Design an enzyme around this catalytic site. Sequence first.
Site, PDB file in Angstrom:
ATOM      1  N   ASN A 189      -6.218   4.102  -4.917  1.00 27.03           N
ATOM      2  CA  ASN A 189      -7.543   3.932  -5.504  1.00 27.03           C
ATOM      3  C   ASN A 189      -8.191   5.274  -5.811  1.00 27.03           C
ATOM      4  OD1 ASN A 189      -7.835   1.189  -5.880  1.00 27.03           O
ATOM      5  ND2 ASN A 189      -8.746   0.817  -3.854  1.00 27.03           N
TER       6      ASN A 189
ATOM      7  N   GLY B 241      -4.858 -11.673  -1.027  1.00 23.45           N
ATOM      8  CA  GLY B 241      -6.077 -10.975  -0.674  1.00 23.45           C
ATOM      9  C   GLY B 241      -6.933 -10.636  -1.881  1.00 23.45           C
TER      10      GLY B 241
ATOM     11  N   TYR C  23     -14.503  -2.166  -9.565  1.00 20.43           N
ATOM     12  CA  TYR C  23     -13.183  -2.779  -9.476  1.00 20.43           C
ATOM     13  C   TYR C  23     -12.735  -3.332 -10.822  1.00 20.43           C
ATOM     14  CZ  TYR C  23     -13.100  -2.247  -4.436  1.00 20.43           C
ATOM     15  OH  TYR C  23     -13.071  -1.720  -3.166  1.00 20.43           O
TER      16      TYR C  23
ATOM     17  N   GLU D 277      17.726  -4.690 -11.705  1.00 19.90           N
ATOM     18  CA  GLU D 277      17.867  -3.423 -12.410  1.00 19.90           C
ATOM     19  C   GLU D 277      16.810  -2.411 -11.990  1.00 19.90           C
ATOM     20  OE1 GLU D 277      18.490  -4.201 -16.491  1.00 19.90           O
ATOM     21  OE2 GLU D 277      19.062  -2.134 -17.014  1.00 19.90           O
TER      22      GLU D 277
ATOM     23  N   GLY E  79      -7.076  -7.003   5.688  1.00 19.90           N
ATOM     24  CA  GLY E  79      -6.468  -7.792   6.745  1.00 19.90           C
ATOM     25  C   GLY E  79      -5.517  -8.850   6.225  1.00 19.90           C
TER      26      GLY E  79
HETATM   27  N1  LIG Z   1      -7.751  -1.304  -7.099  1.00 19.43           N
HETATM   28  C1  LIG Z   1      -8.438  -2.241  -6.453  1.00 19.43           C
HETATM   29  N2  LIG Z   1      -8.603  -2.147  -5.086  1.00 19.43           N
HETATM   30  C2  LIG Z   1      -9.298  -3.098  -4.419  1.00 19.43           C
HETATM   31  C3  LIG Z   1      -9.851  -4.172  -5.102  1.00 19.43           C
HETATM   32  N3  LIG Z   1     -10.485  -4.957  -4.206  1.00 19.43           N
HETATM   33  C4  LIG Z   1     -10.349  -4.411  -2.978  1.00 19.43           C
HETATM   34  N4  LIG Z   1      -9.626  -3.254  -3.095  1.00 19.43           N
HETATM   35  C5  LIG Z   1      -9.246  -2.370  -1.987  1.00 19.43           C
HETATM   36  O1  LIG Z   1      -8.692  -3.173  -0.962  1.00 19.43           O
HETATM   37  C6  LIG Z   1      -9.095  -2.715   0.317  1.00 19.43           C
HETATM   38  C7  LIG Z   1      -9.758  -3.846   1.099  1.00 19.43           C
HETATM   39  O2  LIG Z   1      -8.859  -4.908   1.309  1.00 19.43           O
HETATM   40  P1  LIG Z   1      -9.062  -6.355   0.634  1.00 19.43           P
HETATM   41  O3  LIG Z   1      -8.005  -6.665  -0.398  1.00 19.43           O
HETATM   42  O4  LIG Z   1     -10.432  -6.432   0.008  1.00 19.43           O
HETATM   43  O5  LIG Z   1      -8.974  -7.322   1.924  1.00 19.43           O
HETATM   44  P2  LIG Z   1      -8.148  -8.711   1.968  1.00 19.43           P
HETATM   45  O6  LIG Z   1      -6.740  -8.552   1.452  1.00 19.43           O
HETATM   46  O7  LIG Z   1      -8.878  -9.766   1.171  1.00 19.43           O
HETATM   47  O8  LIG Z   1      -8.107  -9.096   3.541  1.00 19.43           O
HETATM   48  P3  LIG Z   1      -9.452  -9.417   4.382  1.00 19.43           P
HETATM   49  O9  LIG Z   1      -9.825  -8.287   5.320  1.00 19.43           O
HETATM   50  O10 LIG Z   1      -9.208 -10.654   5.213  1.00 19.43           O
HETATM   51  O11 LIG Z   1     -10.559  -9.654   3.378  1.00 19.43           O
HETATM   52  C8  LIG Z   1     -10.069  -1.575   0.089  1.00 19.43           C
HETATM   53  O12 LIG Z   1      -9.378  -0.364   0.277  1.00 19.43           O
HETATM   54  C9  LIG Z   1     -10.480  -1.750  -1.359  1.00 19.43           C
HETATM   55  O13 LIG Z   1     -10.873  -0.546  -1.977  1.00 19.43           O
HETATM   56  C10 LIG Z   1      -9.688  -4.280  -6.474  1.00 19.43           C
HETATM   57  O14 LIG Z   1     -10.180  -5.234  -7.076  1.00 19.43           O
HETATM   58  N5  LIG Z   1      -8.974  -3.306  -7.148  1.00 19.43           N
END
Ligand SMILES: Nc1nc2c(ncn2[C@@H]2O[C@H](COP(=O)(O)OP(=O)(O)OP(=O)(O)O)[C@@H](O)[C@H]2O)c(=O)[nH]1
Lengths: 350, 438, 51, 421
Positions: free
Chosen positions: B206, B10, B224, B254, B144
Amino acid sequence: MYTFVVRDENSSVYAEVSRLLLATGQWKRLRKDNPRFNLMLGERNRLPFGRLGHEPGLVQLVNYYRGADKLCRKASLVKLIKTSPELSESCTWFPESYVIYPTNLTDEREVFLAAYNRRREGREGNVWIAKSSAGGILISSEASELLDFIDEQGQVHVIQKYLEKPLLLEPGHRKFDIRSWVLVDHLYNIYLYREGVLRTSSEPYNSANFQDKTCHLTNHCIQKEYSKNYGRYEEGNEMFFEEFNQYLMDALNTTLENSILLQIKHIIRSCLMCIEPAISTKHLHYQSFQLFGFDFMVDEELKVWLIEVNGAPACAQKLYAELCQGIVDVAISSVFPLATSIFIKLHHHH
Amino acid sequence: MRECISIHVGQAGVQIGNACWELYCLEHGIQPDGQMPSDKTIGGGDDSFNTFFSETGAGKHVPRAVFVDLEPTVIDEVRTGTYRQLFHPEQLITGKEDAANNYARGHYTIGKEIIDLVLDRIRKLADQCTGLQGFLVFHSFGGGTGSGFTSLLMERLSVDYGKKSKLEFSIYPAPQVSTAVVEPYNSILTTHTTLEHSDCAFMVDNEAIYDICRRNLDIERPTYTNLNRLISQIVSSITASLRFDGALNVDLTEFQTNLVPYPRIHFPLATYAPVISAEKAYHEQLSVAEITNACFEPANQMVKCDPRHGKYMACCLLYRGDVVPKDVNAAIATIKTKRSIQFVDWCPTGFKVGINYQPPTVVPGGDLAKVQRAVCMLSNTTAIAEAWARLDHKFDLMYAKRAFVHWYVGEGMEEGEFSEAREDMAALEKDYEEVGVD
Amino acid sequence: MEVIELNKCTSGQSFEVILKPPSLEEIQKKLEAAEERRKYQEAELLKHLAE
Amino acid sequence: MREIVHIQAGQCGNQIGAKFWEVISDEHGIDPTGSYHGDSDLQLERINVYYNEATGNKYVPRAILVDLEPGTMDSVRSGPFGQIFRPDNFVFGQSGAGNNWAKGHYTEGAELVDSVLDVVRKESESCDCLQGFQLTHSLGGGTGSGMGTLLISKIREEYPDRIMNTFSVMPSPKVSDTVVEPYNATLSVHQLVENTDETYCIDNEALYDICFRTLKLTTPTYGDLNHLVSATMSGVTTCLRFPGQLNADLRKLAVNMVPFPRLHFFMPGFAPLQYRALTVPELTQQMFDSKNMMAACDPRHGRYLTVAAIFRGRMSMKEVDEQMLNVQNKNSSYFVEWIPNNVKTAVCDIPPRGLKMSATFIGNSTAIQELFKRISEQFTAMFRRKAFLHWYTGEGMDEMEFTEAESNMNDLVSEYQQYQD
Ligand SMILES: Nc1nc2c(ncn2[C@@H]2O[C@H](COP(=O)(O)OP(=O)(O)OP(=O)(O)O)[C@@H](O)[C@H]2O)c(=O)[nH]1
Ligand SMILES: Nc1ncnc2c1ncn2[C@@H]1O[C@H](COP(=O)(O)OP(=O)(O)CP(=O)(O)O)[C@@H](O)[C@H]1O
Ligand SMILES: Nc1nc2c(ncn2[C@@H]2O[C@H](COP(=O)(O)OP(=O)(O)O)[C@@H](O)[C@H]2O)c(=O)[nH]1
Ligand SMILES: Cc1cc(C(=O)Nc2ccn(C)n2)on1
Ligand SMILES: Cc1cc(C(=O)Nc2ccn(C)n2)on1
Ligand SMILES: [Ca+2]
Ligand SMILES: [Ca+2]
Ligand SMILES: [Mg+2]
Ligand SMILES: [Mg+2]
Ligand SMILES: [Mg+2]
């Protein structure tokens, strides 16, 4: 517009605070479950501290200190004093106390018995008292009656030395306790409400009869029920600081400040300072404040003894307005500002 | 030498993985084109860094990592970014339409269509491993794909790699840096189905990473990039034991032995210090005692909670830079007499201490100042259960009205799977209550 | 304050300090059962559209 | 490459769809000939979502103009931007719809719909991955209303797993063409409930109020009303047409905005609505104001299930949060408490043409039932006497179908009613 919620629908104190907040027109009350609040007036038990300080853009303040029950539980206080170095087991202002669990359930039975035997073995006074947080109190001079009383209960009981030489108010030859309302703001500044109340006993003290607990327990509810001299000497068996400071001068040639208040102020600092590193919300993601109700005993030598600390105290009818407003001024407006202090700041080292 | 395979799922997982492998190359001296002048074993070798990097005959050092996402946008950045020369195109796997913040979509509908292609791409990396330790799975809770596809991959990796460890680096959903409303569902849904397949999970809220960026780094509105440049620093602290010589946390097993006495309570709390803004021209360098004591200030935790009201089951101190054992033991004593560190009765009161002399590497033109000594404290506290309480509560507020449930049922998932997962989270909170409360 | 298992190398060292002693078949049935519920859902969406 | 297929049906649909393509073409730097002359990559980063790429680097909108009479699409073709549309994507008849839902849905529209679906199919086939469809149309007419819903009914049968969104202009007696607009709107709403993922409710009455009072426009025209619709449509699609952390697809936006399948009718809002710059506190206070909303429903009468706010331009995101919070605290009792964090904010660096900064509001409010209650009352006012039904029974409709539409509308009002207490 500041927002707050009311989750304890029984706190007489904060029911007045809530009303005062709305009276400023700048505070809006939400539902008890709306998570977008600035200030929470939380419930007594099972207050959800873990959900505080997790709302974006909202500074949140709660009227309780997570972990202050260690000071407001019968058995917890004794264990806290005996184990804490700042207070030590040789603490001079706390009556000798032992934690006794009912046999149908650490335990200090044997330690208490050896202390008891040493007193009787030396002719000393041996009146003790058994009480618990789920109260149900028993005043006896026989180690058997006290221990068996505890075995007839299902919760933790405490037995501490009964002050056999209490200061008696004249006329009346009666007993009393002192209630001091303390407030600790989010900065941990310890404020003592200048005004206290002495909950007096309308019955003369009779040391030869601990069975009739009406002249030995100064609870406001015991006097107004089983005592037949209620309100005789003072209205509601409540003597306020101005009158009691006057009695101490005419009767003992001393003042409330020197003879009592200095020790009351020292005992408050020593307790709150003791638990600072455990309950302080300095660098925490949410802020805590709390109003405490300290209860003291005064013996005939003018030595102040701490009885218990109340974490959810009420207030004297004549003192609600003044105290509730000060809470808003020192504890709330200090965090959420609007558009002669009634307290006494007890300086200390954080 | 035993290898470690990294899996990034993701947008959250993939972008964090981008920052981590950047730091790894900087820390090991690996150029963006995969060359490593110091490595005298060309095309081979069983050194510590070879747990995370394989070698080709051409001297290129290729990370042992797989990137997976259901839409192409975030993975395309890697295909053309600075380190595009490190990864082979096979290690970068993308679908054509994402999971729309829908767990059911990432676990069933779309996931079932790409799962065997991911496993095949993973198997290809394993075939290069003479002694695979296991996997490190980076992903988000609220996405998702990070939620729905991760658990599916975790279920499958258990079947195909039974005796292999699997550690998670999870992103806990913070409403301030996210634009979703169904994340409480996805988090509980994936935590439910992943619990019995993860040996150890390092959550990062976050909300905590965000506040650190604002407070210590003076970043008004962090991005990000700022969040992940910091997350990579923590992740590097946790995996440094695997990529350098040492004796503490030398293999993925470990991590469970030293941090997880109870299989379900496998969510250690991370605490890092110091975090100094680089704009500050001159900042005083903290001592072992000053950084060690910072591991007990809440403002340095990856998850905001209160360890003063929990019980520790384990605690690790991972030092980097100028740190000698004499000064660690000294500071450990000074912190017992001043801190609320209540271990559980059936556990010794102690600390496992690891010291690596190389100080934290800073990314050229980043947010973090160069410090002479840092520390990451991994501790297993029952106070992290506050995080589950918050999440379960939000879940309960929506699930009472069945809000958004149709999006999930419509993607094949059954409604019962909701309360089934919720009843598990309840049992998880109940387990935390037994171990830390009297 | 006891120090145990002091391991030292060239890039660092580690140890432990003790202060106080202790006092596949079924995976397809769920991916297929949900695929049959989607087929049945769209099977009612098409029949609805035929009416 | 997440393509969207645009469809405009009828007079209102094509006129509203025309200004929309007129507006976003300017934002992305596309002239009336399909040539790009912009100066920012943000214009072309996600340009393929509404535009196909043709020979010579031309950009043709992925759009399909539908009507049952030629007048409106003569205007579109003769207009300045008309030359931007694909010549083959003009699909129209000659009989007209007569402001009659039955003619658009059962008779005239039935004869033409298959050919429309051949053009839609032609666009879909060349799509790397289709997000879904958006339809611009009115509900009070005959083509966009009757044939528009007929189109959607057949797009879902052939694209059951694609998103189907509509920008539906609701009729009002304040700006009325004929007295049968309640009939046509009642008949369309039920279709929209069953077959659209999202329906943006654009009430001409609210548009007249905005042009009259707020905008101080004496006698508003349709073009005046459409300038607002253009600005709104540009806003509620910003998260699509532009990249950044706010880029998403229709399905993801619907997942977080629609907690219940049938309650998918949104209240859009825009601001500002003279050269005075609008401080962040000003944009945000109007954006939640009823006078700034385009569904003619009082938010204070219902409750918000979800809310989105798209800020365009350059400004302090920090100041937005503070002002956004103040708005939430003043109307705290209106947002449902059982959807945590149900008010989100997004930023776009590119402001609309000739504006330092704008705010686009998207609300999923239960107050939208006022709109359906008006339609229902007006419907019953005529149907109780059966007035004007002969226009419909002459096309082979029965009264029973009107009764069912009246019931379906009421059931909709009640379903919204439960989630408001
Ligand atoms: N720490 C951090 N959190 C992130 C980052 N990108 C997205 N998030 C968090 O991830 C969550 C959103 O999920 P995503 O990872 O973007 O979604 P996905 O895994 O690609 O799945 P999809 O819904 O199909 O796009 C939110 O709560 C964001 O704040 C990042 O680069 N760094
Ligand atoms: N060690 C002791 N010596 C003398 N009197 C004592 C005593 N312990 C308790 N008392 C008497 O008991 C009364 C208070 O008892 P205690 O405070 O333990 O019960 P409680 O906690 O239910 C009352 P509250 O919580 O409202 O202050 C006092 O009036 C005091 O006179
Ligand atoms: N806002 C707006 N409303 C319109 C426009 N044209 C028509 N309408 C409204 O739409 C209804 C008439 O429908 P119309 O589009 O003419 O029917 P059709 O051409 O047969 O599909 C009436 O309620 C009008 O108020 C327009 O350009 N803008
Ligand atoms: C075309 C189109 C765009 C949308 C849509 O829901 N857009 C949204 C929702 C929330 N934000 C910020 N944008 O629906 N049809
Ligand atoms: C309520 C609500 C509104 C939104 C919303 O606009 N979400 C967006 C916008 C852009 N992305 C990637 N997600 O989510 N919940
Ligand atoms: Ca097992
Ligand atoms: Ca014909
Ligand atoms: Mg009592
Ligand atoms: Mg994604
Ligand atoms: Mg017309």
